[PDB]
């Protein structure tokens, strides 16, 4: 519940050059609706309705969070791409929320796979069937990265169910699990649609982006999610918490290790890509600011509950905060009623 | 540093061996020879089959040498698993070793990878065709969770080799690249998960320990390998990329500063492996203890790492580290130094021709 969030954020927004996202409320609304619309229609189909066991109210919320995440972060990709990426990252978020045991449905995973038989686990059944709509936007290398990260992610959610923060002294455990379910190579490779980027011409810059972006993305999220994952921790495990349990350190030391990493990550991100192919830098830069924007506005992070508490300050922290925060709401704050409609359950009913 | 930091290398090495508790075992030479031969024999008959001979484009000699080195690594490090399991892991780890010999671009063979997988059509890249066709023989020794770890790691490894075809050590300033690449081609989760056959271990009951072992074994293994390999690669102008060489290029540091990074990490991982597992299930700590010793013994005995050069150079010297090292070395050889003629026969080529 600290206030250190200030120096961490500003240093974070000034390091990446958080000069707001790259859109106009008109354009943001344009993409949000097209994305939501196609995804909303997809999840409302009978087959998707039957195999994806999810509470409507929650699927609706999950879909809206993701479309936001995508449209706001993958700014330079086509409308179709944002939409297909929204369907995929919505499947991942729904899995992250399941409590069903993967074990029994994973017993004949390879043999069914190798044989081309529908997977026993319903989530694999749907995602794999839909996957081509995501992969059509990319070359073979980027596709491999999307496939692996999603397979890793599935193991991550498997492990994340034992709600294990690690054995004390198991120093390699924390980051092991975090990379496992961070979709780092999925996110980092989906930033390069073959339509505007050549996978062979920019192989090296793309590879480097996947390696560096994997940590920036997950770390920044863990950072923005601190004010969230504690005000109502439910036997929760998290990168920050697992550091405590495993490295045997205090919460302040933990959240400090993380913040130091995020800053170094941001620093090297600019140092390495600043002078590379301008189009690459542009996508990278839009993701960072957009990902930040999305975090500041989405309900899921309740970052609103830290506005007025510092909107009456006069320092170099609680002040350079809202100066940025506000910028977020100027384009990031958009009433759902302007794009998220009709609700999924409604299309499903018809 | 045109000269190999012998003293530094010897010191770090002994610190490693002590940290892991390197010592004698109830695993005799006669037992090793039995396993070495059994694993080789099954694998040799496999790679000698025509289909395998056609699709796997590899120089016969190099195939022979790769198999013998992998059989030695498996038999000596997976000491607690069945003879069959040793044979099958042998076939698998040889496939992955051979893939590094390929120079052919995967790009055109991966354009329809997902659609073919989903449809159950044989993969276009011939390596994937063989590896996936033979996978079940490996996977049968394990449960679902450990199997998933074997499958992911091998897929990661394929991407790892693809990336290495570019001989790229990272952009100056790309600090996250080195470890990213090393984990991609390390087979960390493959190794870590293959240590637990469902025949003598229960994933569900030992999930927390197996998972932790994977996370920790991943880094121990790759770093111990980089370390013990530091001597053979020091003067090899052919091997341009490696974890340490990339630390140099990506982090913009000196070879010594980079080498220091590896050793600090290596010893800390060793200290934590012991600290963490000594008080857990006895069987687990045993499989874990055997792998580390086995793995080390292997590095010391396979002529590939040329460590006998460091031995024969300090064999006569009163310094502490030197004597401690040779003691560990001579210790390794007594049970490790086995002539190929006692188990690696007949040659694959011969079985293939017949
Ligand atoms: Mg979860
Ligand atoms: Mg190398």
Nearby residues for ligand 1 (ion, Cβ within 5 Å): A 96, 160
For residue A231, the tally of other CB atoms under 10 A from its CB is 10
Indicate yes or no: CB of B180 within 8 angstroms of CB of A151: no
Please provide the DSSP assignment of B271-307 as one string.
Answer: HHHHHHHTTS-HHHHHHHHHHHHHHHHHHHHSGGG-T
Residues of B in contact with A208 (CB under 8 A): 170-171, 174, 177
A163: left (phi over 0), alpha (psi -120 to 50) or beta: left
For residue B146, what is the DSSP state? H
What string of H, E and C letters represents the secondary structure of chain A? CCCCHHHHHHHHHHHCCCCCCCCCHHHHHHHHHHHHHHHHHHHCCHHHHHHCCCCHHHHHHHHHHHHHHHHHHCCCCCHHHHHHHHHHHHHHHHHHCCCCCCHHHHCCHHHHHHHCCCCCCHHHHHHHHHCHHHHCCCCHHHHHHHHHHHHHHHHHHHHHCCCCCCCCCCCCHHHHHHHHCCCHHHHHHCCCCCCCCCCCCCHHHHHHHHHHHHHHHHHHHHHHCCCCCCCCCCCCCCHHHHHHHHHHCCHHHHHHHHHHHHHHHHHHHHHHHCCCCHHHHHHHHHHHHHHHHHHHHCHHHCHHHHCHHHCCCCCCCHHHHHHHHHHHHCCCCCCHHHCCCCCHHHHHHC
Do the Cβ atoms of A166 and A141 come closer than 8 Å? no
Closest B-chain CA to A171: B272
Phi then psi dihedrals of residue B154, to 5 deg: -70, -35
Widest CA span of chain A, in angstroms? 65
Q: Is B177 a catalytic residue?
A: no
As a whole number of angstroms, the distance between CA A235 and CA A164 comes to: 10
Classify residue B2 by burial, with Cβ atoms within 10 Å: 0-12, 13-18, 19+.
exposed
CB contacts < 8 A (A, B): 148
As a whole number of angstroms, the distance between CA B298 and CA B191 comes to: 15
CA nearest to A339, candidates A131, A86, A133: A86
As a whole number of angstroms, the distance between CA B16 and CA B220 comes to: 11
For residue B64, what is the DSSP state? H
User: What technique determined this structure?
Assistant: X-ray
Closest B-chain CA to A147: B114
For residue A179, the tally of other CB atoms under 10 A from its CB is 20
Do the Cβ atoms of B15 and B268 come closer than 8 Å? no
Indicate yes or no: CB of A148 within 8 angstroms of CB of B159: yes
Q: Collapsing DSSP states into helix, strand and coil, what is residue B206? A: helix
For residue B198, what is the DSSP state? T
Rounded distance from Cα A157 to ligand 1 centre (Å): 5
Chain-centroid distance of CA B143 in Å reads 22
Long-range contacts of B17-21 (CB under 8 A, 24+ apart): B17/B296, B17/B324, B17/B328, B19/B267, B19/B270, B19/B271, B19/B274, B20/B270, B20/B273, B20/B274, B20/B289, B20/B292, B20/B293, B20/B296, B21/B274, B21/B289
Do the Cβ atoms of A289 and A20 come closer than 8 Å? yes
Dihedral of CA A166/A169/A170/A172: which sign?
Answer: positive
For residue A2, the tally of other CB atoms under 10 A from its CB is 11
**For residue A14, what are the contacts with CB-CB under 8 A and spacing of at least 6?**
none
Long-range contacts of B350-354 (CB under 8 A, 24+ apart): B350/B48, B351/B44, B351/B45, B351/B48, B352/B47, B352/B48, B352/B49, B352/B50, B352/B53, B352/B60, B354/B48
Residues of A in contact with B145 (CB under 8 A): 103, 106, 155, 158
Q: Collapsing DSSP states into helix, strand and coil, what is residue B187? A: coil
As a whole number of angstroms, the distance between CA B110 and CA A70 comes to: 27
CA nearest to B283, candidates B209, B214, B345: B209
For residue B122, what is the DSSP state? P
Q: Collapsing DSSP states into helix, strand and coil, what is residue B216? A: helix
Q: Is B182 a catalytic residue?
A: yes
Closest B-chain CA to A199: B107
Rounded distance from Cα B230 to ligand 2 centre (Å): 9
Do the Cβ atoms of A210 and A188 come closer than 8 Å? yes
Q: Token pair for residue A51?
A: 């195999």
For residue B319, what is the DSSP state? S
Residues of B in contact with A111 (CB under 8 A): 136
Q: Token pair for residue A171?
A: 């120093």
As a whole number of angstroms, the distance between CA B241 and CA B167 comes to: 6
Rounded distance from Cα A238 to ligand 1 centre (Å): 10
**For residue A10, what are the contacts with CB-CB under 8 A and spacing of at least 6?**
A316, A317, A320, A321, A324
Do the Cβ atoms of A250 and A244 come closer than 8 Å? yes
Rounded distance from Cα B99 to ligand 2 centre (Å): 14
Separation in Å, CA A55 to CA A52, A58, A130: 9, 5, 21
Do the Cβ atoms of B190 and B155 come closer than 8 Å? no
Rg, Å, chain A Cα set: 20
Dihedral of CA A212/A225/A73/B185: which sign?
Answer: positive
Phi then psi dihedrals of residue B307, to 5 deg: -70, -20
Q: Which ligand is nearest to the CA of B236?
A: 2
Q: Collapsing DSSP states into helix, strand and coil, what is residue B186? A: coil
Q: Is A151 a catalytic residue?
A: no
Q: Which ligand is nearest to the CA of B237?
A: 2
As a whole number of angstroms, the distance between CA B211 and CA B220 comes to: 14
As a whole number of angstroms, the distance between CA B224 and CA A229 comes to: 37
Rounded to the nearest 10°, the torsion over CA B239, B241, B243, B247 is: 130
Residues of B in contact with A173 (CB under 8 A): 212, 215-216
As a whole number of angstroms, the distance between CA A116 and CA B142 comes to: 21
- Of B172, B181, B272, which is closest to A171 when you measure between CB atoms? B272
Rounded distance from Cα A168 to ligand 1 centre (Å): 21
> Peptide bond before A342: cis, by omega within 30 degrees of 0?
yes
As a whole number of angstroms, the distance between CA B344 and CA B71 comes to: 9
A183: left (phi over 0), alpha (psi -120 to 50) or beta: left
Q: Which of A144, A157, A215 to mutate to test the interface with B (most CBs of B within 10 A)?
A: A144
- Of A128, A144, A264, which is closest to B159 when you measure between CB atoms? A144
CA nearest to B5, candidates B235, B298, B247, B220: B235
Residues in chain B: 354
Indicate yes or no: CB of A106 within 8 angstroms of CB of B151: no
Residues of B in contact with A265 (CB under 8 A): 176
Closest B-chain CA to A128: B118
Give the domains, in start order, of chain A with CATH numbers: 1-350 (1.10.600.10)
Q: Which ligand is nearest to the CA of A178?
A: 1
Residues of B in contact with A272 (CB under 8 A): 171-174
Q: Token pair for residue B124?
A: 């276009």
Dihedral of CA A112/A118/A122/A127: which sign?
Answer: positive
Rounded distance from Cα B241 to ligand 2 centre (Å): 5
> What ranges in chain B are assigned the alpha helix state H?
6-20, 29-47, 50-55, 60-77, 83-99, 107-110, 113-119, 126-139, 144-164, 177-184, 188-194, 203-234, 243-250, 255-277, 282-301, 308-314, 320-336, 348-353
Give me the catalytic one of B97, B150, B187, B243.
Answer: B97
Q: Is B313 a catalytic residue?
A: no
User: Half-sphere exposure (CA, 13 Å, Cβ side) for B100?
Assistant: 16
Q: Is B231 a catalytic residue?
A: no
Residues of B in contact with A103 (CB under 8 A): 144-145, 204
Q: Token pair for residue B8?
A: 């530094």
CA nearest to B75, candidates B98, B99, B91: B91
- Tell me the nearest-neighbour CA distance from B166 into chain A, angstroms: 8
Do the Cβ atoms of A261 and A252 come closer than 8 Å? no
User: Half-sphere exposure (CA, 13 Å, Cβ side) for B351?
Assistant: 19
Q: Token pair for residue B255?
A: 């070879």
Residues of A in contact with B111 (CB under 8 A): 139-140
Chain-centroid distance of CA B9 in Å reads 20
As a whole number of angstroms, the distance between CA A214 and CA A185 comes to: 6
Q: Token pair for residue A74?
A: 């993958």
Indicate yes or no: CB of A162 within 8 angstroms of CB of B119: no
CA nearest to A263, candidates A2, A3, A16: A16
Indicate yes or no: CB of B177 within 8 angstroms of CB of A115: no
Q: Is B97 a catalytic residue?
A: yes
Classify residue A3 by burial, with Cβ atoms within 10 Å: 0-12, 13-18, 19+.
middle
User: Half-sphere exposure (CA, 13 Å, Cβ side) for A97?
Assistant: 15
**For residue A160, what are the contacts with CB-CB under 8 A and spacing of at least 6?**
A96, A177, A181, A237
Q: Is B305 a catalytic residue?
A: yes
- Tell me the nearest-neighbour CA distance from A278 into chain B, angstroms: 16
As a whole number of angstroms, the distance between CA A16 and CA A263 comes to: 9
Q: Collapsing DSSP states into helix, strand and coil, what is residue B12? A: helix
Q: Token pair for residue A342?
A: 């009709």
Separation in Å, CA B35 to CA A64, B72, B84, B90: 58, 9, 9, 11
Residue matched to tokens 């600011």: A289
CA nearest to A206, candidates A180, A222, A187, A220: A187
As a whole number of angstroms, the distance between CA A100 and CA A94 comes to: 12
Indicate yes or no: CB of A172 within 8 angstroms of CB of B272: yes
Indicate yes or no: CB of A131 within 8 angstroms of CB of B110: no
As a whole number of angstroms, the distance between CA B77 and CA B32 comes to: 11
Rounded to the nearest 10°, the torsion over CA A123, A124, A126, A129 is: 170
**For residue A283, what are the contacts with CB-CB under 8 A and spacing of at least 6?**
A75, A76, A191, A192
Closest B-chain CA to A144: B159
Q: Which of B124, B148, B265 to mutate to test the interface with A (most CBs of A within 10 A)?
A: B148
Chain-centroid distance of CA B108 in Å reads 29
């Amino acid at each position: 519940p600290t206030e250190y969030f200030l120096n961490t954020t500003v240093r974070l927004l000034e390091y990446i050059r958080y000069r707001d996202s790259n859109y106009t409320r008109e354009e943001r609304i344009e993409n949000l609706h097209y994305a939501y619309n196609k995804a909303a229609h997809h999840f409302a189909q009978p087959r998707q309705q039957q195999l994806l066991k999810v509470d409507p109210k929650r699927l609706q919320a999950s879909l809206q969070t993701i479309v936001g995440m995508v449209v706001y972060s993958w700014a330079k990709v086509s409308k179709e791409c944002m939409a297909d990426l929204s369907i995929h990252y919505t499947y991942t978020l729904v899995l992250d929320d399941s409590k069903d045991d993967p074990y029994p449905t994973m017993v004949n995973y390879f043999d069914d796979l190798q044989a081309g038989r529908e997977q026993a686990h319903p989530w694999w059944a749907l995602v794999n069937e839909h996957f081509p709509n995501v992969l059509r936007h990319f070359g073979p290398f980027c596709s491999l990265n999307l496939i692996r990260s999603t397979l890793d992610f599935f193991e991550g959610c498997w492990i994340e169910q034992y709600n294990f923060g690690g054995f004390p002294g198991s120093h390699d455990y924390p980051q092991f699990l975090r990379r496992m379910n961070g979709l780092g190579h999925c996110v980092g490779a989906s930033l390069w649609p073959k339509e505007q980027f050549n996978e062979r011409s920019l192989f090296l810059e793309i590879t480097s982006a996947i390696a560096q972006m994997e940590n920036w993305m997950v770390w920044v999220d863990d950072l923005m999610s601190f004010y969230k994952e504690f005000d109502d921790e439910r036997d929760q495990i998290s990168l920050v918490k697992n550091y405590v349990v495993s490295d045997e350190i205090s919460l302040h030391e933990a959240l400090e290790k993380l913040t130091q990493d995020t800053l170094h990550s941001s620093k090297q991100m600019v140092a390495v890509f600043s002078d590379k192919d301008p189009q690459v830098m542009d996508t990278i830069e839009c993701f960072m600011h957009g990902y930040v924007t999305w975090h500041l506005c989405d309900r899921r992070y309740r970052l609103s509950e830290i506005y007025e508490k510092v909107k009456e300050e006069k320092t170099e922290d609680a002040q350079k905060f809202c100066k940025f925060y506000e910028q977020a709401a100027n384009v990031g704050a958009v009433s759902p009623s302007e794009w998220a409609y009709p609700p999924v359950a409604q299309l499903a009913n018809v």
